[PDB]
């Protein structure tokens, strides 16, 4: 019984491997061996934001390129204005162990969650001058590690019980569940058309999910340890993954396999966050040896360094018009570079 | 500057004035993490110090006008190499062990080895509670189960000269107690570096002094931390 199923798995695995190998007729490095490089890239610190009492663990820009939300493990979400550094909102939470935050694409809500297995929604523009909790979404059986809005009435969450879910806010019930990972799910990324998404687990694996029918379309392997961050290429046909073995990689969807590996011979730390430039030429990445690195995404050569944090870098994000970069670390400070 | 800019600046000033108070309250409260296994009696210690669905529970007690918070994690899976990283800035970890269970003692030892040696938990002290002393006395005096069936080296062990067998107990109980204590103190001293220590205590299920012991140990931890600046 088990022998037949194991044999079936082995045969299908071998066939899929051979089918992928039959279509590998060139490598990205060779075809991109004739491009003039980008030279040295040097960036400067224009703002520094002070005010948290403990480490910072997440951050997210708005669709206006001007306002930020950030969150600390002392019980505070803070909404910042970056052109001047004025503070706009400071929201005290109920549980002080919080691991993620997100900002709505219209400017009217924020969300957060953590070791208590609940996602809480906060409504900003109310009839009074305050912010009031509107909803508490409960039903996961492990901590929340990421969440992203689709509109003002749907949200997607990933948790440490090895699942993902899609929630209807006005009702408070799960509209669909995405099961199939084996370890803890650690990150999400939404497609530009918001009809698919991708996720990566505490298992050297990533998966492509279709929202409408709740099925898994493809599986991608290649890393050697757990995956910590993920994001899409600007046109929506490739993505990049950073893992806990000192390596980023770039995968492509249509060809169904790996394209490039970004690694160095003197780097032996882990990776905490990744993101892309607006045209897709640069890839930024944050490490836990206190630093961030800027790579050339088409030739795989290091081009720059961001340095100036006294503790492990944890979050990192790039605006919707490409003007600025924001970093946050475990020493309680946010920095804006340009 | 127009009226809008001045109004924004005053709003930011109010937020700052509140954050100062929150800072003063936060800086004067101690935070503790409670760890153990299901057969350890961890809950009895919790309920005893409670006289001073969800994924985490909290217990608040106060001694001599100092406030302690104690955090206990429930309703999570049994893989813990990711959420444990959230606890790298507490004051102390409290580790509870059932000392009468010979079968599941090497697992407790392995847990201690992992907690002692992590990269993000290298500067945090441990308070160790070797629970259930009376059950250990009954088991040893019964004479039908032998410790050496799991640890051979007990056959070559003698009682230390700093023992304090105050209430006139049987000598065999004293040998057993101090052997089991030394098993954890070996791991404690093998790979420390002067950055964190371990404080062992014998205890049972009818004690009334665990809060005072935590008070004194936390006091000493803070004093060493202050002194370390003069090196």
């Amino acid at each position, epitope marked *: 019984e088990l022998d037949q199923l194991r044999q079936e798995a082995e045969q299908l695995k071998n066939q899929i491997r051979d089918a992928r190998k039959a279509c590998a007729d060139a490598t990205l490095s060779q075809i991109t061996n004739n491009i003039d490089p980008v030279g040295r890239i040097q960036m400067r610190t224009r703002r520094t934001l002070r005010g948290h009492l403990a480490k910072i663990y997440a951050m997210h820009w708005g669709t206006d390129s001007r306002l930020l939300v950030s969150a600390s493990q002392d019980g505070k979400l803070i909404i910042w204005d970056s052109y001047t550094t004025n503070k706009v909102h400071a929201i005290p939470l109920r549980s002080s162990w919080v691991m993620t935050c997100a900002y709505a694409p219209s400017g009217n809500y924020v969300a957060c969650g953590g070791l208590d297995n609940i996602c809480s929604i906060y409504n900003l523009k109310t009839r009074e001058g305050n912010v009031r909790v509107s909803r508490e979404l409960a039903g996961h059986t492990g901590y929340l590690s990421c969440c992203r809005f689709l509109d003002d009435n749907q949200i997607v969450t990933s948790s440490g019980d090895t699942t993902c879910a899609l929630w209807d806010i006005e009702t408070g019930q799960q509209t669909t569940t995405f099961t199939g990972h*084996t*370890g803890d799910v650690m990150s999400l990324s939404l497609a530009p058309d918001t009809r698919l998404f991708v996720s990566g687990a*505490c*298992d*050297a694996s990533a998966k492509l999910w279709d929202v409408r029918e709740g099925m898994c379309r493809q599986t991608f*392997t*290649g890393h*050697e*340890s*757990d995956i910590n961050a993920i994001c899409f290429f600007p046109n929506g046909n490739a993505f990049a993954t950073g893992s*806990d*073995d000192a390596t980023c990689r770039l995968f492509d969807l249509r060809a169904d396999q790996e394209l490039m590996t970004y690694s160095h011979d003197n780097i*032996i730390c*882990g990776i905490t966050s990744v993101s892309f430039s607006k045209s897709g030429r640069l890839l930024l990445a944050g490490y836990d040896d206190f630093n961030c690195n800027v790579w050339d995404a088409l030739k795989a050569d290091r081009a720059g360094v961001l340095a100036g944090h006294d503790n492990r870098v944890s979050c990192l994000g790039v605006t919707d018009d490409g003007m600025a970069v924001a970093t946050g670390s475990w020493d309680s400070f946010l920095k804006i570079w340009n | 500057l127009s009226a809008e800019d001045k109004a924004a600046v005053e709003r930011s000033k109010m937020i700052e004035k509140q954050l100062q108070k929150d800072k003063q309250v936060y800086r004067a409260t101690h935070r503790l993490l409670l760890l153990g296994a299901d057969n350890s009696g961890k809950s009895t210690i919790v309920k005893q110090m409670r006289i001073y669905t969800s994924g985490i529970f909290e217990t608040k007690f106060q001694v001599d006008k100092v406030n302690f918070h104690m955090f206990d994690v429930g309703a999570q899976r*049994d*893989e*813990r*190499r990711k959420w*444990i990283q959230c606890f790298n800035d507490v004051t102390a970890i409290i580790f509870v062990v059932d000392s009468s269970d010979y079968n599941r003692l*090497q*697992e407790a030892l*392995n847990d201690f*080895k*992992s907690i002692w*040696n*992590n*990269r993000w938990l290298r500067t945090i002290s441990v308070i160790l509670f070797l629970n259930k002393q009376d059950l250990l006395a009954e088991k040893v005096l019964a004479g039908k189960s032998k410790i050496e069936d*799991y*640890f*051979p080296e007990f056959a070559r062990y003698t009682t230390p000269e700093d023992a304090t067998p105050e209430p006139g107990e049987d000598p065999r109980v004293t040998r057993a107690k101090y052997f089991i204590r030394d098993e954890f103190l070996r791991i404690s001293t093998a790979s420390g570096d002067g950055r964190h220590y371990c404080y062992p205590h014998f205890t049972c299920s009818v004690d009334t002094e665990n809060a005072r012991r935590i008070f004194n140990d936390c006091r000493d931890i803070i004093q060493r931390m202050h002194l370390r600046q003069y090196e």
Partner: nanobody
Amino acid sequence: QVQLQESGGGLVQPGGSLRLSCAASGFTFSNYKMNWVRQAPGKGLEWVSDISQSGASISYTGSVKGRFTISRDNAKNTLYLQMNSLKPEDTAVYYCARCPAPFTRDCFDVTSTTYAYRGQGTQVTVS
């Protein structure tokens, strides 16, 4: 694609011996610390022995101390366990496990129920 495959189990009489071996694939072998665990009919998972990256540090559990030996080969990418004088309490299903991250002294989560970097195991019977 991480892969670990154990081989060498079987059925022996008391006082006999055998030798288990894991063949590994999909990662740099000599970056990681390796372990042997086991499960017996009616209990949970129990840690048996441990070896480091170079072969210079070795550790055992109490009940097997003078009898089992652990060793590794970084050229063929393989682990060996030698079991010498066996008792009817040694019958079990044996598994081969890898530490989660490289270049590390600790080892979280090797005995848990569902672990990603563990093999399929082999059956050993003493009778």
